[PDB]
Ligand binder design. Structure first.
Ligand SMILES: CCCc1c(F)c(F)c(S(N)(=O)=O)c(F)c1F
Ligand SMILES: CCCc1c(F)c(F)c(S(N)(=O)=O)c(F)c1F
Ligand SMILES: OC[C@H]1O[C@@H](O)[C@H](O)[C@@H](O)[C@@H]1O
Ligand SMILES: [Zn+2]
Length: 257
C-alpha cells in the first residue's frame, strides 16, 4: 500500500490514484507576493470550546487525534466557508530534521512540521458523503517551527510512547485543541485536495500565516513513532509529507491586507 518511502511514496501515488495529477491538488507553495487580499472573506470563526476528543491512533502514516462529531461540538465557520464545518480529527506531518516536514511552503520555505485540523461540511451529513463533494471539507493548517515549547502540545507528545506502532490507539479524552493555535488567525485560502491518498479534491484549505513554536524535544518525540506494526523491523515515522503540487488554475487569497 501507499506510504512515504522511495518505493511507495508521493511520486508513485498516481498509479493507483490518478487524481494525483489533477487540477486542484494539495499542498502548494504559497507565493506571498502573488496572494491577494480578499475583502469578500467574512471573519473566520474557530469555535472549539465544546470539543470532545476521544482517542489517538497511529494509522501507519501519522497519528490522528479523533473527536466526537455526532453534534456541532467543535466547528469552523466564516472566512471562505459557506455554512458549518465540524471537526473530526487532527494530525501532523513532519520531517526527519527541522529543515523539512511541512506540506505547504511559504515562498518555498519549508517548516519543521504542519498541523491539520480536518472538518466536514454538515450539509452533507457524514464525512463519507462530504468527500463526494467539491466543498465537502475544510482543513485548517498551522505551521510548526522549533523554538520554545508549546505547552498545549505536551499531552500529545507524552502519549506517543503508547502508540508507537501502526494500529495502536489510546484513550485521549479531554484534550483542548485551542492550545495548538497561534495568536493570530490571519490566513491564506485556496481550493485543493486531501494530501494523502485517495487525494480527493474536496478541500477548502485555510492555512494560518503565524506558525506555532514547539521545542526540539517535542518534535524529536514525533520522530520516535514507527510506520511499521508491532514486531516488525523499525521504520521511523519521519518525512510523512507530500511536496508542493502545481497550482494550475488557482489563486491564493489572503485574509489580511
Ligand atoms: C507495492 C505498491 C507500490 F509500488 C505502489 F506504488 C503503491 S501506490 N501507487 O499506492 O503508491 C502501492 F499501493 C503499492 F502497494
Ligand atoms: C483520508 C481521509 C482522512 C484525511 C483527511 F480528511 C485529510 F483532510 C487529510 S489532509 N492531510 O489533507 O489534511 C488527511 F491526511 C487524511 F488522512
Ligand atoms: O477580472 C478581475 C478579477 O480577476 C480575478 O482573477 C481576481 O481574483 C479578482 O480579484 C479580480 O477582481
Ligand atoms: Zn494532513
Amino acid at each position: 500500500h501507499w506510504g512515504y518511502g522511495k518505493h511507495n511514496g508521493p511520486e508513485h501515488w498516481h498509479k493507483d490514484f490518478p487524481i494525483a495529477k489533477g487540477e486542484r491538488q494539495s499542498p502548494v507553495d504559497i507565493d506571498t507576493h502573488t496572494a491577494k487580499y480578499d475583502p469578500s472573506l467574512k471573519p473566520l470563526s474557530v469555535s472549539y470550546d465544546q470539543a470532545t476528543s476521544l482517542r489517538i491512533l497511529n494509522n501507519g502514516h501519522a497519528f490522528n487525534v479523533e473527536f466526537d462529531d455526532s453534534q456541532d461540538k467543535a466547528v469552523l465557520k466564516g472566512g471562505p466557508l459557506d455554512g458549518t464545518y465540524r471537526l473530526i480529527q487532527f494530525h501532523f506531518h513532519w520531517g526527519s530534521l527541522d529543515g523539512q516536514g511541512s506540506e505547504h511552503t511559504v515562498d518555498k520555505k519549508k517548516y519543521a512540521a504542519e498541523l491539520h485540523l480536518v472538518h466536514w461540511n454538515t450539509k452533507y451529513g457524514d464525512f463519507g458523503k462530504a468527500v463526494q463533494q467539491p466543498d465537502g471539507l475544510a482543513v485548517l493548517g498551522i505551521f510548526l517551527k522549533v523554538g520554545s515549547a508549546k505547552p498545549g502540545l505536551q499531552k500529545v507528545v507524552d502519549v506517543l510512547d503508547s502508540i508507537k506502532t501502526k494500529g495502536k490507539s489510546a484513550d485521549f479524552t479531554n484534550f483542548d485543541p485551542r492550545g495548538l493555535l497561534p495568536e493570530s488567525l490571519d490566513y491564506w485560502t485556496y481550493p485543493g485536495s486531501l494530501t494523502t491518498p485517495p487525494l480527493l479534491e474536496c478541500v477548502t484549505w485555510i492555512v494560518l500565516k503565524e506558525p506555532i513554536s514547539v521545542s526540539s524535544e517535542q518534535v524529536l518525540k514525533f520522530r520516535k513513532l514507527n510506520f511499521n506494526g508491532e514486531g516488525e523491523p523499525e521504520e521511523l515515522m519521519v518525512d510523512n509529507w507530500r511536496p508542493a503540487q502545481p497550482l494550475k488554475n488557482r489563486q491564493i487569497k489572503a485574509s489580511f491586507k
